[PDB]
């Protein structure tokens, strides 16, 4: 049941990778990293030391999970999406002491080639469209697109838009499962 | 010296079909189901899935992952770190391997550096997707599209320069490099 | 320079003291890299490339032929350079490369893209994800697709209290250094 690791991958002494996880070609994981069970890390992923990745997190090719990135259970990182840890980098000024956290909450989907400016929290089951640039917190269930990203709707856990306004108070059901969502002052939650 | 073939660091899985005179560079991984034509170039860290067909003289720059259900015709150009997809609405907790949508890129299309194509879109012959655009709808033959999301702003000749053609209606234009004539018919561009 | 054993640095490449080359980097034999640089995972460097001193290049950056990086340039993770403006696979355009010159202290944010031909000014700052397709003035802060200027960044890397255009003066509070905006061009006084 131990994690399976491609022979071309480099997992540095000390790293913790949970059962049933799968680590693919030319992945490098630093020794501080903690990765849960049933994760998948695609070709050329990088993982830093100051990183916690939960269970069943699927990370596509070419994603660098840097120090100060935290991924909850069931997060999806699409191909070539990009995390950061310094807000205002300058090569002349080492900013390793100024890292900002990026927290991605359970079930959030980070679309292909999106970018997340450090300091943002991405809420539970949020959905960041392909290519978006996130530079503010993303509410639970929010669908955001564009550069920079702006909220255009709400996404059910299953991954389809809810017939719910952005603002105010309202209720709606998932078009697939029928489960109910409540909007209260512009914040969406599961009933 | 000798012509480069397949860099020794590449991994080409048993079964892959690669045409003559193609060049596969450092730390490329090609899956066993893939078919790749003649005269192609695959840059550093390319990935190619199993359910993939790539034509002839397809030039793929570094860091492009040609996933299952992407199909590239002859003379397609994939710019550095452009991005294909195959699931429209991914959720880690919901496996969607039976829900892949095709991305078909027709002959001569150019996909600019760091663009992204949302699966399901078809990219027309000799289309031109500007650097960093995000394509989420079909792109007509010859269309020049830019932006997030991508919008059509012009028409690009086979040579790769804008044609003096309006976006809609009927019109004609000539490429000054080749003298090739183009006809627009109710907003659809073709070579004469 | 210190070079990870998985990196491939082709014979002829010049790499200065105190530089660090990380996992599965490939550097071509014509490249010139200065002192105190850092090249992250899977970086690629072409032959017709000059990279100055103390240039920090994060993972997944391809520094292609005709890209020139001055000292103290920062290239963020997965940012993207180009060298052909209008590529077509059928038409080899290796003779038509356009230069991309990135001047001293400029920062290229994560996952930005620079269309070849642009010059990026000294201490400019290209926001994460921007697509640059025009020259970026010294100290300009630009964001968006395509990139548009929204302010001015000090060397330290925080916005200066200057109008977007016009004539004005400002001081960096971290260093006390003075900036002068003359006819929309910012400089150190
Ligand atoms: C967000 C997404 C799921 C579409 O959701 P949807 O509910 O079907 O939304 P629609 O297509 O109706 O689009 C709604 C609006 O948002 C815009 N939009 C949708 N996705 C967008 C994106 N990624 N970037 C910018 N705008 C986008 C649409 O253009 C439309 O606006 P318009 O009418 O002004 O043109 C899809 O576009 C997307 O980004 N998928 C991600 C695919 C991916 O990253 N997969 C990775 C795994 S392989
Ligand atoms: C599209 C491209 C070829 C320019 O074509 P062009 O016919 O010269 O067009 P122009 O530069 O006149 O631009 C026309 C409009 O489109 C905009 N535009 C052009 N390219 C754009 C891009 N990639 N993204 C967003 N907008 C863009 C321009 O800003 C201009 O708009 P504006 O007048 O409102 O500012 C070029 O910008 C590009 O994207 N090249 C791709 C380079 C590449 O990917 N190379 C990879 C191989 S190394
Ligand atoms: C540019 C940046 C430094 C913010 O600078 P700032 O002076 O704090 O600017 P603000 O956040 O006040 O933003 C000012 C405006 O520009 C917009 N903006 C800021 N950064 C943006 C970006 N990258 N793309 C698009 N828009 C952006 C903001 O949304 C705001 O406009 P709005 O009011 O319409 O929303 C930051 O967003 C950024 O891009 N950092 C780069 C991180 C990176 O690449 N790190 C790499 C090393 S790990
Ligand atoms: C990766 C990281 O967090 N980078 C931040 C950092 O940059 P940098 O150029 O100094 O790099 P870097 O820490 O040396 O690592 C470079 C590469 O070496 C590899 N690397 C490095 C160390 C290690 O122990 N293992 C390893 O694999 C691994 O491949 C790694 O990617 O400081 C910058 C800053 O000051 O603003 C921040 O903006 C950056 N986000
Ligand atoms: C690659 C791919 O098509 N991913 C889709 C997929 O995700 P995932 O995390 O389950 O991955 P994955 O199939 O295990 O392959 C991961 C990596 O392992 C390597 N890989 C994998 C298998 C193989 O035979 N060879 C190989 O190299 C190779 O490097 C590969 O990149 O299911 C998602 C979903 O359900 O929504 C879809 O959104 C994703 N687009
Ligand atoms: C990389 C580069 O500058 N590409 C430009 C080029 O495309 P292309 O497909 O012909 O490639 P390429 O020169 O064969 O190199 C491909 C890969 O082989 C590797 N490579 C290649 C040669 C070499 O000596 N060493 C090496 O590592 C290395 O990994 C390299 O990335 O001609 C196009 C064009 O005509 O418009 C331009 O738009 C492209 N910007
Ligand atoms: Na990218």
Automatic annotation (TrEMBL), chain A:
UMP binds at residues 43, 58, 60-61. The gene is wlbB. PANTHER family: ACETYLTRANSFERASE (PTHR43300), ACYL-[ACYL-CARRIER-PROTEIN]--UDP-N-ACETYLGLUCOSAMINE O-ACYLTRANSFERASE (PTHR43300:SF4). The keyword Chloroplast does not apply. GO terms for molecular function: acyltransferase activity; nucleotide binding. Acetyl-CoA binds at residues 85-87, 112, 130, 135, 150, 161. This is Lipopolysaccharides biosynthesis acetyltransferase. Its EC number is 2.3.1.-. CoA binds at residues 85-87, 112, 130, 135, 150, 161. UDP binds at residues 22, 24, 40, 43, 58, 60-61. It holds the Pfam family Hexapep. Keywords: Acyltransferase, Nucleotide-binding, Transferase. CDD domains: LbH_WxcM_N_like (cd03358). It comes from the Bacteria. Belongs to the transferase hexapeptide repeat family. The keyword Nucleotide-binding applies. It is an enzyme of class 2 (transferase). InterPro entries: Hexapep, Trans_hexapeptide_repeat, Trimer_LpxA-like_sf. Transmembrane segments: none annotated.
UniProtKB/TrEMBL annotation, chain B:
The keyword DNA repair does not apply. One of its GO terms (molecular function) is acyltransferase activity. Its EC number is 2.3.1.-. Acetyl-CoA binds at residues 86-88, 113, 131, 136, 151, 162. CoA binds at residues 86-88, 113, 131, 136, 151, 162. Keywords: Acyltransferase, Nucleotide-binding, Transferase. Pfam families: Hexapep. The keyword Transport does not apply. This is Lipopolysaccharides biosynthesis acetyltransferase. The lineage of its organism: Bacteria, Pseudomonadati, Pseudomonadota, Betaproteobacteria, Burkholderiales.
């Amino acid at each position: 049941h131990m994690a399976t690791i491609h022979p071309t991958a480099i997992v540095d002494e000390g790293a913790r990778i949970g059962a049933h996880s799968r680590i693919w070609h030319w992945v490098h994981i630093c020794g501080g990293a903690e990765i849960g069970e049933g994760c998948s890390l695609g070709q050329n992923v990088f993982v830093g030391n100051r990183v916690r990745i939960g269970n069943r997190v699927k990370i596509q090719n070419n994603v660098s999970v840097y120090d100060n990135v935290f991924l909850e259970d069931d997060v999806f990182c699409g191909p070539s999406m990009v995390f950061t840890n310094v807000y205002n980098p300058r090569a002349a000024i080492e900013r390793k002491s100024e890292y900002r956290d990026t927290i991605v909450r359970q079930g959030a989907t980070l679309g292909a080639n999106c970018t997340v400016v450090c300091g943002a929290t991405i809420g539970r089951y949020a959905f960041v469209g392909a290519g978006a640039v996130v530079n503010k917190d993303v509410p639970d269930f929010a669908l955001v697109v564009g550069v920079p990203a702006r909220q255009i709707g709400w996404m059910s856990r299953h991954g389809e838009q809810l017939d719910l306004p952005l603002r105010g108070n309202a209720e709606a059901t998932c078009p697939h499962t029928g489960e109910r969502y409540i909007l209260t002052d512009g914040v969406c939650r599961l009933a």
